[PDB]
Amino acid sequence: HMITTTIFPGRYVQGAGAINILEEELSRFGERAFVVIDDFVDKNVLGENFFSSFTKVRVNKQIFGGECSDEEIERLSGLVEEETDVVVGIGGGKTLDTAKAVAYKLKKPVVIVPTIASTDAPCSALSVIYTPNGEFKRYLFLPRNPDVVLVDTEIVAKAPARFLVAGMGDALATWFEAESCKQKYAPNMTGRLGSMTAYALARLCYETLLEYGVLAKRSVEEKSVTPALEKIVEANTLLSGLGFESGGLAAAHAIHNGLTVLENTHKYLHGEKVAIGVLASLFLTDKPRKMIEEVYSFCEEVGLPTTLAEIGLDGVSDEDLMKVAEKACDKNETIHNEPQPVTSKDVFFALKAADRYGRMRKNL
Ligand SMILES: [Cl-]
Ligand SMILES: [Zn+2]
């Protein structure tokens, strides 16, 4: 009853060139590290011989199979030597979630090194597990958040701007969903209530996006790191992570989940579809005119979708939209954390209204 719980990664390290202090961070755990790395990252981001420069920590480097599946988690787990002191994940979301799962299975600390700032999952005590074919299988709730999250903003700036923008879409949802949970007194990912700190970090996330998002996008377009980019990477990773996990999820992510039932949306990134969920949720939950205008203006300036056509649903049928709404309103979905009672028809209507509003702003 009214008890809060806020969870955190142990250490969050961020800056241009931070990959160069990875050895120092691993050495705080011991002398043996098991590294799970994305193949593209090994060859094109760190360089195949990157670990040859280590002198204080012995690395067992293993190329990630590509899918965070129970099968891959089992395969990698069997390659870990007993004397291993720390597990490391370097790459995108699936690589990081796999590393978290392997560390959990072997009861070892984990260091998470995202090479893109495209979702707010890095700092979380969660791994999303898929079948070998890439279809969602289940959520693995972890007992501990990562011991270290290390973000090299120079590596992030060299990745395509599309990925930073998608991270801003995943982050954009944080305040709206956490605010709904705060109003509802809904539980967060721990089962207890969010703290004043969690809700304040979710609001800071949103304010940071509005103020620095465009400046950060201009920086990444030139593969450059500026303080504006640093603030947005921190917002997309640390603030958004804490805000969604300890503040809570609500309509936007449930709507994103419903959108996955339409195959035309599969080529779009998580954060791009979350943005559509956010916009629909502003109509659904009765936001005032100035707030709706503020969010659409932000999406327009950074290049997030504001219409169904922009996520591959140009001319989508009412029948297809109702499938999305029904999926979003599954009894176990987060949309029920909204203070208002929500039915599928309400979501269907909000998606259509949000789309029409976005199209008219764009003179379509
Ligand atoms: Cl989020
Ligand atoms: Zn998300």
GROMACS .gro file of C-alpha atoms and ligand atoms in nm:
model
  366
    1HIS     CA    1   0.000   0.000   0.000
    2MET     CA    2   0.156   0.322  -0.131
    3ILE     CA    3   0.509   0.185  -0.113
    4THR     CA    4   0.732   0.292  -0.401
    5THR     CA    5   1.021   0.110  -0.561
    6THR     CA    6   1.273   0.256  -0.806
    7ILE     CA    7   1.545   0.041  -0.966
    8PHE     CA    8   1.871   0.141  -1.129
    9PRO     CA    9   2.170   0.011  -1.323
   10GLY     CA   10   2.479   0.025  -1.098
   11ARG     CA   11   2.690   0.265  -1.301
   12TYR     CA   12   2.601   0.469  -1.612
   13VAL     CA   13   2.908   0.591  -1.805
   14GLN     CA   14   2.874   0.816  -2.110
   15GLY     CA   15   3.087   1.027  -2.338
   16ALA     CA   16   3.279   1.059  -2.661
   17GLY     CA   17   3.546   0.792  -2.665
   18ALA     CA   18   3.403   0.602  -2.371
   19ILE     CA   19   3.481   0.270  -2.540
   20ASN     CA   20   3.843   0.346  -2.446
   21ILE     CA   21   3.768   0.308  -2.078
   22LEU     CA   22   3.580  -0.023  -2.128
   23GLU     CA   23   3.887  -0.220  -2.010
   24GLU     CA   24   3.909  -0.007  -1.697
   25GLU     CA   25   3.540  -0.074  -1.624
   26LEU     CA   26   3.570  -0.449  -1.676
   27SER     CA   27   3.881  -0.463  -1.453
   28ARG     CA   28   3.668  -0.345  -1.160
   29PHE     CA   29   3.504  -0.691  -1.177
   30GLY     CA   30   3.809  -0.907  -1.228
   31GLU     CA   31   4.052  -1.029  -1.492
   32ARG     CA   32   3.832  -1.245  -1.715
   33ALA     CA   33   3.549  -1.114  -1.936
   34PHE     CA   34   3.316  -1.297  -2.177
   35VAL     CA   35   3.210  -1.066  -2.459
   36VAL     CA   36   2.904  -1.110  -2.679
   37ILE     CA   37   2.939  -0.884  -2.981
   38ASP     CA   38   2.739  -0.802  -3.292
   39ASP     CA   39   2.932  -0.910  -3.603
   40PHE     CA   40   2.890  -0.575  -3.776
   41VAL     CA   41   3.019  -0.404  -3.464
   42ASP     CA   42   3.320  -0.636  -3.434
   43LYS     CA   43   3.430  -0.574  -3.792
   44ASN     CA   44   3.313  -0.220  -3.862
   45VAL     CA   45   3.276  -0.032  -3.535
   46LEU     CA   46   3.539  -0.163  -3.291
   47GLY     CA   47   3.758  -0.337  -3.545
   48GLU     CA   48   3.839  -0.708  -3.533
   49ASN     CA   49   4.155  -0.659  -3.333
   50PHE     CA   50   4.020  -0.408  -3.083
   51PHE     CA   51   4.066  -0.639  -2.785
   52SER     CA   52   4.429  -0.710  -2.871
   53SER     CA   53   4.516  -0.388  -2.691
   54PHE     CA   54   4.386  -0.515  -2.354
   55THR     CA   55   4.651  -0.598  -2.089
   56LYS     CA   56   4.460  -0.620  -1.761
   57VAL     CA   57   4.155  -0.823  -1.866
   58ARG     CA   58   4.147  -1.146  -2.067
   59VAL     CA   59   3.866  -1.146  -2.320
   60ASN     CA   60   3.677  -1.444  -2.459
   61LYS     CA   61   3.514  -1.279  -2.761
   62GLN     CA   62   3.207  -1.448  -2.914
   63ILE     CA   63   3.018  -1.330  -3.221
   64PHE     CA   64   2.645  -1.304  -3.156
   65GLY     CA   65   2.421  -1.527  -3.370
   66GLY     CA   66   2.181  -1.238  -3.429
   67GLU     CA   67   1.870  -1.342  -3.243
   68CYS     CA   68   1.805  -1.314  -2.869
   69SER     CA   69   1.655  -1.663  -2.841
   70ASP     CA   70   1.667  -1.924  -2.567
   71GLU     CA   71   1.868  -2.134  -2.812
   72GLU     CA   72   2.133  -1.863  -2.856
   73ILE     CA   73   2.139  -1.783  -2.486
   74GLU     CA   74   2.203  -2.155  -2.421
   75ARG     CA   75   2.475  -2.176  -2.688
   76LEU     CA   76   2.666  -1.879  -2.553
   77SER     CA   77   2.621  -1.983  -2.191
   78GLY     CA   78   2.799  -2.309  -2.268
   79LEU     CA   79   3.103  -2.120  -2.397
   80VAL     CA   80   3.153  -1.921  -2.078
   81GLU     CA   81   3.450  -2.044  -1.869
   82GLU     CA   82   3.384  -2.090  -1.496
   83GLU     CA   83   3.658  -1.843  -1.405
   84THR     CA   84   3.468  -1.567  -1.592
   85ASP     CA   85   3.425  -1.253  -1.383
   86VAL     CA   86   3.191  -1.048  -1.602
   87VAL     CA   87   2.969  -1.084  -1.910
   88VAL     CA   88   2.962  -0.803  -2.168
   89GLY     CA   89   2.716  -0.721  -2.446
   90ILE     CA   90   2.825  -0.486  -2.728
   91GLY     CA   91   2.585  -0.386  -3.004
   92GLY     CA   92   2.213  -0.335  -3.059
   93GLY     CA   93   1.913  -0.439  -2.849
   94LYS     CA   94   1.919  -0.810  -2.921
   95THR     CA   95   2.289  -0.844  -2.842
   96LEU     CA   96   2.244  -0.655  -2.515
   97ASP     CA   97   1.936  -0.854  -2.406
   98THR     CA   98   2.125  -1.177  -2.483
   99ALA     CA   99   2.417  -1.067  -2.268
  100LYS     CA  100   2.181  -0.980  -1.981
  101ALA     CA  101   2.018  -1.323  -2.006
  102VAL     CA  102   2.352  -1.510  -2.019
  103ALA     CA  103   2.477  -1.317  -1.714
  104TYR     CA  104   2.155  -1.392  -1.528
  105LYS     CA  105   2.173  -1.765  -1.612
  106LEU     CA  106   2.535  -1.780  -1.489
  107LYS     CA  107   2.495  -1.545  -1.192
  108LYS     CA  108   2.755  -1.301  -1.315
  109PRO     CA  109   2.766  -0.920  -1.334
  110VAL     CA  110   2.698  -0.769  -1.676
  111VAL     CA  111   2.832  -0.464  -1.864
  112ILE     CA  112   2.606  -0.335  -2.142
  113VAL     CA  113   2.757  -0.131  -2.427
  114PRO     CA  114   2.495   0.003  -2.675
  115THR     CA  115   2.633   0.109  -3.012
  116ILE     CA  116   2.312   0.292  -3.108
  117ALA     CA  117   2.074   0.501  -2.894
  118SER     CA  118   1.756   0.370  -3.051
  119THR     CA  119   1.556   0.235  -2.754
  120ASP     CA  120   1.548   0.281  -2.381
  121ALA     CA  121   1.605  -0.087  -2.304
  122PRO     CA  122   1.978  -0.084  -2.213
  123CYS     CA  123   1.945   0.008  -1.846
  124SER     CA  124   1.648  -0.217  -1.780
  125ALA     CA  125   1.616  -0.539  -1.586
  126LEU     CA  126   1.446  -0.702  -1.880
  127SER     CA  127   1.542  -0.917  -2.179
  128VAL     CA  128   1.301  -0.965  -2.471
  129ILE     CA  129   1.328  -1.323  -2.598
  130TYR     CA  130   1.232  -1.441  -2.944
  131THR     CA  131   1.196  -1.766  -3.133
  132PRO     CA  132   1.488  -1.849  -3.369
  133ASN     CA  133   1.273  -1.695  -3.648
  134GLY     CA  134   1.254  -1.361  -3.475
  135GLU     CA  135   0.895  -1.383  -3.354
  136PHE     CA  136   0.827  -1.258  -3.001
  137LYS     CA  137   0.835  -1.541  -2.750
  138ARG     CA  138   0.838  -1.397  -2.397
  139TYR     CA  139   0.970  -1.135  -2.159
  140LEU     CA  140   1.242  -1.236  -1.919
  141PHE     CA  141   1.218  -1.016  -1.604
  142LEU     CA  142   1.559  -0.998  -1.444
  143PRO     CA  143   1.635  -0.971  -1.071
  144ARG     CA  144   1.900  -0.703  -1.123
  145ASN     CA  145   1.959  -0.418  -1.366
  146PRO     CA  146   2.292  -0.415  -1.551
  147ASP     CA  147   2.597  -0.344  -1.337
  148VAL     CA  148   2.734  -0.100  -1.592
  149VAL     CA  149   2.587   0.069  -1.898
  150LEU     CA  150   2.865   0.231  -2.106
  151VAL     CA  151   2.767   0.459  -2.394
  152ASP     CA  152   3.030   0.597  -2.635
  153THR     CA  153   2.858   0.891  -2.799
  154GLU     CA  154   3.114   0.901  -3.079
  155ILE     CA  155   3.008   0.548  -3.183
  156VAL     CA  156   2.646   0.655  -3.161
  157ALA     CA  157   2.710   0.967  -3.375
  158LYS     CA  158   2.862   0.752  -3.648
  159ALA     CA  159   2.546   0.540  -3.674
  160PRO     CA  160   2.265   0.657  -3.910
  161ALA     CA  161   2.052   0.947  -3.783
  162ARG     CA  162   1.743   0.729  -3.834
  163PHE     CA  163   1.843   0.531  -3.524
  164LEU     CA  164   1.884   0.838  -3.301
  165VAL     CA  165   1.545   0.965  -3.417
  166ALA     CA  166   1.383   0.627  -3.342
  167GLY     CA  167   1.535   0.643  -2.992
  168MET     CA  168   1.371   0.985  -2.952
  169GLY     CA  169   1.036   0.823  -3.048
  170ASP     CA  170   1.073   0.551  -2.779
  171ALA     CA  171   1.177   0.827  -2.535
  172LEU     CA  172   0.893   1.060  -2.633
  173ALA     CA  173   0.646   0.810  -2.489
  174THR     CA  174   0.812   0.803  -2.149
  175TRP     CA  175   0.658   1.107  -1.989
  176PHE     CA  176   0.307   1.047  -2.124
  177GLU     CA  177   0.300   0.689  -2.008
  178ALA     CA  178   0.465   0.752  -1.674
  179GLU     CA  179   0.229   1.047  -1.607
  180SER     CA  180  -0.072   0.821  -1.669
  181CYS     CA  181   0.068   0.563  -1.426
  182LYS     CA  182   0.132   0.838  -1.169
  183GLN     CA  183  -0.230   0.957  -1.199
  184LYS     CA  184  -0.366   0.602  -1.177
  185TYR     CA  185  -0.134   0.496  -0.894
  186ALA     CA  186  -0.047   0.201  -1.123
  187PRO     CA  187   0.245  -0.030  -1.050
  188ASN     CA  188   0.570  -0.007  -1.243
  189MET     CA  189   0.787  -0.297  -1.365
  190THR     CA  190   0.863  -0.391  -0.999
  191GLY     CA  191   0.506  -0.426  -0.891
  192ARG     CA  192   0.520  -0.129  -0.648
  193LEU     CA  193   0.448   0.238  -0.724
  194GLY     CA  194   0.681   0.479  -0.898
  195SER     CA  195   0.868   0.740  -0.692
  196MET     CA  196   0.863   1.116  -0.728
  197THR     CA  197   1.217   1.068  -0.873
  198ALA     CA  198   1.104   0.828  -1.144
  199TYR     CA  199   0.823   1.059  -1.255
  200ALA     CA  200   1.051   1.362  -1.250
  201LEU     CA  201   1.311   1.184  -1.465
  202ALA     CA  202   1.038   1.091  -1.714
  203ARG     CA  203   0.937   1.459  -1.738
  204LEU     CA  204   1.304   1.565  -1.776
  205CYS     CA  205   1.335   1.315  -2.059
  206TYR     CA  206   1.052   1.487  -2.248
  207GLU     CA  207   1.182   1.841  -2.182
  208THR     CA  208   1.527   1.738  -2.305
  209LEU     CA  209   1.388   1.596  -2.628
  210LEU     CA  210   1.194   1.915  -2.705
  211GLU     CA  211   1.489   2.136  -2.644
  212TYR     CA  212   1.780   1.947  -2.790
  213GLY     CA  213   1.638   1.689  -3.029
  214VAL     CA  214   1.683   1.888  -3.349
  215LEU     CA  215   2.029   2.005  -3.242
  216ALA     CA  216   2.132   1.646  -3.173
  217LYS     CA  217   1.995   1.530  -3.509
  218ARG     CA  218   2.201   1.796  -3.691
  219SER     CA  219   2.506   1.675  -3.502
  220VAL     CA  220   2.454   1.308  -3.596
  221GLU     CA  221   2.391   1.406  -3.959
  222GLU     CA  222   2.756   1.520  -3.955
  223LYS     CA  223   2.873   1.215  -3.747
  224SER     CA  224   2.967   1.463  -3.478
  225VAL     CA  225   2.935   1.480  -3.101
  226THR     CA  226   2.813   1.796  -2.933
  227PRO     CA  227   2.678   1.858  -2.582
  228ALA     CA  228   2.326   1.865  -2.737
  229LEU     CA  229   2.386   1.509  -2.867
  230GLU     CA  230   2.518   1.405  -2.526
  231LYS     CA  231   2.197   1.529  -2.362
  232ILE     CA  232   1.974   1.344  -2.610
  233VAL     CA  233   2.173   1.019  -2.580
  234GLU     CA  234   2.140   1.046  -2.200
  235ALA     CA  235   1.769   1.114  -2.239
  236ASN     CA  236   1.714   0.824  -2.483
  237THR     CA  237   1.906   0.585  -2.259
  238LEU     CA  238   1.926   0.674  -1.888
  239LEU     CA  239   1.629   0.906  -1.840
  240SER     CA  240   1.391   0.714  -2.060
  241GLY     CA  241   1.506   0.383  -1.916
  242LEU     CA  242   1.441   0.485  -1.558
  243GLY     CA  243   1.122   0.663  -1.650
  244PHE     CA  244   0.958   0.375  -1.828
  245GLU     CA  245   1.075   0.099  -1.592
  246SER     CA  246   1.019   0.275  -1.259
  247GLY     CA  247   0.751   0.520  -1.378
  248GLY     CA  248   0.545   0.282  -1.590
  249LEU     CA  249   0.399   0.200  -1.932
  250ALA     CA  250   0.047   0.279  -2.053
  251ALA     CA  251  -0.125   0.353  -2.387
  252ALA     CA  252   0.159   0.428  -2.625
  253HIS     CA  253   0.343   0.102  -2.593
  254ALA     CA  254   0.019  -0.100  -2.602
  255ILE     CA  255  -0.069   0.074  -2.930
  256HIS     CA  256   0.283   0.000  -3.064
  257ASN     CA  257   0.219  -0.365  -2.976
  258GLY     CA  258  -0.111  -0.360  -3.160
  259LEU     CA  259   0.056  -0.214  -3.471
  260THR     CA  260   0.278  -0.523  -3.495
  261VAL     CA  261  -0.023  -0.729  -3.611
  262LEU     CA  262  -0.003  -0.552  -3.950
  263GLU     CA  263   0.299  -0.679  -4.144
  264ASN     CA  264   0.349  -0.354  -4.340
  265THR     CA  265   0.480  -0.202  -4.017
  266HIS     CA  266   0.757  -0.452  -3.963
  267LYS     CA  267   1.014  -0.256  -4.161
  268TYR     CA  268   0.980   0.032  -3.916
  269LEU     CA  269   1.182   0.065  -3.598
  270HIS     CA  270   1.034   0.027  -3.251
  271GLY     CA  271   1.061   0.399  -3.171
  272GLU     CA  272   0.904   0.504  -3.500
  273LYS     CA  273   0.590   0.299  -3.423
  274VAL     CA  274   0.593   0.409  -3.058
  275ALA     CA  275   0.568   0.769  -3.185
  276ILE     CA  276   0.240   0.684  -3.364
  277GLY     CA  277   0.120   0.525  -3.037
  278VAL     CA  278   0.206   0.846  -2.852
  279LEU     CA  279   0.016   1.069  -3.098
  280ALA     CA  280  -0.292   0.844  -3.090
  281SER     CA  281  -0.272   0.837  -2.710
  282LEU     CA  282  -0.283   1.222  -2.696
  283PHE     CA  283  -0.627   1.212  -2.860
  284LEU     CA  284  -0.734   0.906  -2.663
  285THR     CA  285  -0.653   1.058  -2.326
  286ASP     CA  286  -0.784   1.409  -2.385
  287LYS     CA  287  -0.473   1.618  -2.399
  288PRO     CA  288  -0.527   1.991  -2.447
  289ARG     CA  289  -0.476   2.155  -2.785
  290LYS     CA  290  -0.145   2.318  -2.701
  291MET     CA  291   0.004   1.985  -2.592
  292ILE     CA  292  -0.111   1.806  -2.905
  293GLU     CA  293   0.041   2.091  -3.113
  294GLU     CA  294   0.369   2.073  -2.914
  295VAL     CA  295   0.416   1.701  -2.968
  296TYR     CA  296   0.325   1.703  -3.338
  297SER     CA  297   0.562   1.998  -3.387
  298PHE     CA  298   0.841   1.805  -3.219
  299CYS     CA  299   0.781   1.496  -3.434
  300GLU     CA  300   0.776   1.712  -3.747
  301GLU     CA  301   1.107   1.879  -3.668
  302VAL     CA  302   1.301   1.566  -3.588
  303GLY     CA  303   1.143   1.346  -3.852
  304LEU     CA  304   0.928   1.107  -3.646
  305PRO     CA  305   0.613   0.978  -3.822
  306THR     CA  306   0.290   1.168  -3.761
  307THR     CA  307   0.065   0.972  -4.001
  308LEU     CA  308  -0.023   0.608  -4.061
  309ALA     CA  309   0.125   0.630  -4.411
  310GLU     CA  310   0.465   0.704  -4.256
  311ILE     CA  311   0.469   0.361  -4.090
  312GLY     CA  312   0.353   0.177  -4.402
  313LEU     CA  313  -0.018   0.203  -4.352
  314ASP     CA  314  -0.124   0.443  -4.628
  315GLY     CA  315  -0.490   0.371  -4.698
  316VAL     CA  316  -0.514   0.111  -4.423
  317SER     CA  317  -0.865  -0.041  -4.386
  318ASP     CA  318  -1.092   0.001  -4.085
  319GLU     CA  319  -1.082  -0.374  -4.052
  320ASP     CA  320  -0.701  -0.369  -4.020
  321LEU     CA  321  -0.710  -0.078  -3.776
  322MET     CA  322  -0.960  -0.259  -3.561
  323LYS     CA  323  -0.721  -0.558  -3.537
  324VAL     CA  324  -0.455  -0.315  -3.411
  325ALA     CA  325  -0.698  -0.170  -3.154
  326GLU     CA  326  -0.812  -0.510  -3.031
  327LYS     CA  327  -0.452  -0.627  -2.985
  328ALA     CA  328  -0.365  -0.302  -2.802
  329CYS     CA  329  -0.653  -0.359  -2.560
  330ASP     CA  330  -0.575  -0.718  -2.463
  331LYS     CA  331  -0.664  -0.761  -2.093
  332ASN     CA  332  -0.298  -0.795  -2.003
  333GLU     CA  333  -0.181  -0.487  -2.200
  334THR     CA  334  -0.040  -0.176  -2.039
  335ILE     CA  335  -0.314   0.044  -2.181
  336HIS     CA  336  -0.525  -0.049  -1.879
  337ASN     CA  337  -0.281   0.154  -1.665
  338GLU     CA  338  -0.452   0.464  -1.809
  339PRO     CA  339  -0.681   0.635  -1.554
  340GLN     CA  340  -0.971   0.618  -1.802
  341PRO     CA  341  -1.130   0.281  -1.888
  342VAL     CA  342  -1.022   0.197  -2.245
  343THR     CA  343  -1.196  -0.017  -2.507
  344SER     CA  344  -1.077  -0.118  -2.852
  345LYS     CA  345  -1.320   0.116  -3.027
  346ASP     CA  346  -1.169   0.412  -2.834
  347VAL     CA  347  -0.820   0.323  -2.964
  348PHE     CA  348  -0.949   0.266  -3.319
  349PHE     CA  349  -1.108   0.613  -3.314
  350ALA     CA  350  -0.796   0.777  -3.167
  351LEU     CA  351  -0.571   0.628  -3.434
  352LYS     CA  352  -0.794   0.761  -3.711
  353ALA     CA  353  -0.828   1.106  -3.559
  354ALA     CA  354  -0.454   1.136  -3.492
  355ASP     CA  355  -0.380   1.033  -3.849
  356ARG     CA  356  -0.623   1.288  -3.997
  357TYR     CA  357  -0.480   1.563  -3.778
  358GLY     CA  358  -0.123   1.474  -3.883
  359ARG     CA  359  -0.219   1.458  -4.252
  360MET     CA  360  -0.388   1.800  -4.243
  361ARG     CA  361  -0.085   1.958  -4.076
  362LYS     CA  362   0.122   1.825  -4.365
  363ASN     CA  363  -0.126   1.948  -4.629
  364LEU     CA  364  -0.209   1.595  -4.742
  365CL      CL  365   0.975   0.465  -2.342
  366ZN      ZN  366   0.987   0.103  -2.598
   0.00000   0.00000   0.00000
